[PDB]
C-alpha cells in the first residue's frame, strides 16, 4: 500500500534496558531491528578492536550504517525499529535528513533507570562478558560516578508519541503492555 511506514526509535543511556526492550518490540511487532551496538560488534569482528578511540570511530560509522540501512527499508514501505543512545545535538538533523529521502511516522520509546542500577548493570555485563570487549566501555571510578549522576537521556524532538520506560525495577515492567502501546500507535 501507499501508507507511510513507521519508524520506532528506542533510545536511552547505556544499560537502561533499550537493548532488551527493542528486541522484544522486534519479536512482538515482527519488524526489522537496527541496533548501533549490534552494528559495532559486526565491525569489531570483521576489522578488529583496540581502544576507546577506535570504538568511537566504529560507533560513528555504525550510526552512518544505521541511517543508510533505515532509508532503504523505509523506502520499500516497511516499518522498522532503530535502537541507540541517540543524541539530540546530532541525531535530530540526521532524522530530518532521513525523513526527506524516506518519509516515516515516528514513535519513540525512551528507557531510563536509576544511577545505582545502571552502575550495577554496566559492571556485571563487563565482568560476565555479556558486553563485546571492543566497546572499551569507560568503566573507571569517574566514569561510574558520571553514570550515577547523569539523569535521563533527552529524547529526540521528532514529534509523535513518546513513552518513557523506567527499568530500575524490572519486575514491574510488563513487556506486552509496551508492545501494545506501540501497536495502538501503529494502528492510528
Provide the binding-site residues for a second copy, judged by CB under 8 A.
26, 30-34, 38-39, 42-43, 45-47, 57-58, 60-61, 64-65, 68-69, 72-73, 75-78, 80
Q: Which one of Cl ion, a second copy, none interacts with residue 78, CB within 5 to 8 A by kind?
A: a second copy
Q: How far is the CB of 11 from Cl ion (least distance, A)?
A: 11
Stretch that binds Cl ion, among 15-23, 28-36, 74-82, 94-102 (CB under 5 A): 15-23
Q: Which one of Cl ion, a second copy, none interacts with residue 57, CB within 5 to 8 A by kind?
A: a second copy
Q: Which one of Cl ion, a second copy, none interacts with residue 45, CB within 5 to 8 A by kind?
A: a second copy
Q: How far is the CB of 172 from a second copy (least distance, A)?
A: 29
Give Rg (Cα) of the chain.
Answer: 16
Q: Which one of a second copy, Cl ion, none interacts with residue 19, CB within 5 to 8 A by kind?
A: Cl ion
Q: How far is the CB of 22 from a second copy (least distance, A)?
A: 11
Q: How far is the CB of 111 from a second copy (least distance, A)?
A: 20
Rounded to an integer, what distance in angstroms lies between the CA atom of residue 1 and that of residue 95? 23
Q: Comparing C-alpha atoms, which of 131, 156, 136 is closest to residue 15?
A: 131
Could you say whether residue 84 binds Cl ion (CB under 5 A)? no
Per-residue DSSP letter, 83: E
Q: Which one of a second copy, Cl ion, none interacts with residue 60, CB within 5 to 8 A by kind?
A: a second copy
**Which residues inside 18-37 make contact with Cl ion, applying CB under 5 A?**
18-19
Residues in contact with Cl ion by the rule CB under 5 A: 17-19
Amino acid at each position: 500500500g501507499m501508507q507511510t511506514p513507521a519508524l520506532i526509535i528506542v533510545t536511552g543511556h547505556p544499560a537502561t534496558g533499550k537493548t532488551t526492550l527493542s528486541q522484544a518490540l522486534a519479536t512482538g511487532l515482527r519488524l526489522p531491528l537496527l541496533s548501533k551496538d549490534a552494528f559495532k560488534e559486526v565491525m569489531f569482528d570483521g576489522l578488529g578492536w583496540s581502544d576507546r578511540e577506535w570504538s568511537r570511530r566504529v560507533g560513528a560509522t555504525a550510526i552512518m550504517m544505521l541511517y543508510h540501512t533505515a532509508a532503504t527499508i523505509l523506502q520499500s514501505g516497511q516499518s522498522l525499529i532503530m535502537e541507540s543512545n541517540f543524541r539530540v545535538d546530532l541525531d535530530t538533523e540526521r532524522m530530518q535528513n532521513l525523513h526527506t529521502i524516506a518519509p516515516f511516522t515516528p514513535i519513540q520509546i525512551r528507557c531510563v533507570a536509576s544511577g545505582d542500577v545502571l552502575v550495577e548493570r554496566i559492571l556485571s555485563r563487563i565482568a560476565q562478558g555479556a558486553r563485546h570487549p571492543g566497546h572499551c566501555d569507560d568503566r573507571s571510578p569517574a566514569d561510574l560516578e558520571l553514570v550515577r549522576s547523569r539523569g535521563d537521556i533527552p529524547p529526540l524532538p521528532l514529534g509523535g508519541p513518546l513513552l518513557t520506560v523506567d527499568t530500575t525495577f524490572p519486575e514491574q515492567i510488563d513487556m506486552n503492555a509496551i508492545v501494545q502501546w506501540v501497536r495502538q500507535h501503529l494502528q492510528s
